[PDB]
Amino acid sequence: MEELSEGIKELNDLLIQRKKTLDDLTAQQKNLQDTVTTFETIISELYDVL
Amino acid sequence: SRKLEAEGIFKSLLDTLRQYDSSIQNLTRSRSQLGHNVNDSSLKINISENLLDRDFHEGISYEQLFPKGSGINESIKKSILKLNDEIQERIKTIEKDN
C-alpha cells in the first residue's frame, strides 16, 4: 500500500516537470512558427518586388 | 524539424535579400546612367543577419523587422510601384520628345 502512494507522488512530480518542459517547448515552437512565417512572407514580398 | 526548416529558410532569406540588394544596385546604376540618381538606401531592405542566433525562448515576428505601416507590401512595394509609374511617365515624356 505504501509503494502505491510513493509511485503516485513520483508520477505527479514527473508530470509537473514534464508540464514545465512542455510549456517551454510550446513557447519555442510558437516562436519558430512565427519566425518561419515571417521569413516566408518576407521572401514572397522580396520576390514580387524583384 | 521546424528548427532545421527555420535555419534553411533563414539562409534562403539571406540569399534572397542579397539578390534583392544586387538588383537594387543595378537598377540604381541604370537610372543614374540617365541622370536619375536613385537613393540606394531608400529601396534597400535591412535584415539582421544574427536574428536567428537568439534563443528560441525569445519571440521573432514580422512586426519586429517590419512594424505596421512599414512592411514591404505596405511601403516598399508601393514606393517601387510609384517609381515604376514615374519611370513610365518619363518614358511617355521622352517618347513625346522623340
> Could you give the CA distance from residue B3 to residue B54 in angstroms, rounded to a whole number?
12
Alpha helices in B1-98, H assignment, sequence order: 2-33, 40-43, 62-65, 77-97
- Angle between helical axes of B2-33 and A2-49 (0-180°, round to 10): 20
Which residue pairs, CB below 8 angstroms and at least 24 apart, start in B21-26? B21/B45, B23/A50
User: At residue A25, what is the residue type?
Assistant: L
Question: How many angstroms is the resolution?
Answer: 3.2
Interface contact flag, A38 B76, Cβ < 8 Å: no
CB–CB of A37/B6 below 8 Å? no
Chain B residues whose CB is inside 8 A of the A47 CB are: 16
Chain A residues whose CB is inside 8 A of the B56 CB are: 27-28, 31-32
Cβ neighbours, 10 Å, residue B14 = 15
> Could you give the CA distance from residue B95 to residue B89 in angstroms, rounded to a whole number?
10
Which of A25, A28, A34, A38 would you mutate first to test chain B, the one with the most B CBs within 10 A? A38
Method: cryo-EM
Interface contact flag, B12 A31, Cβ < 8 Å: no
Taking only Cα atoms into account, the Rg of chain B, rounded to an integer number of angstroms, comes to: 18
Q: Among positive and negative, which fits the CA dihedral B10, B11, B12, B16?
A: positive
Residues whose CB is less than 8 angstroms from the CB of residue B3 and which lie 6 or more positions away in sequence, other chains included? A32, B56
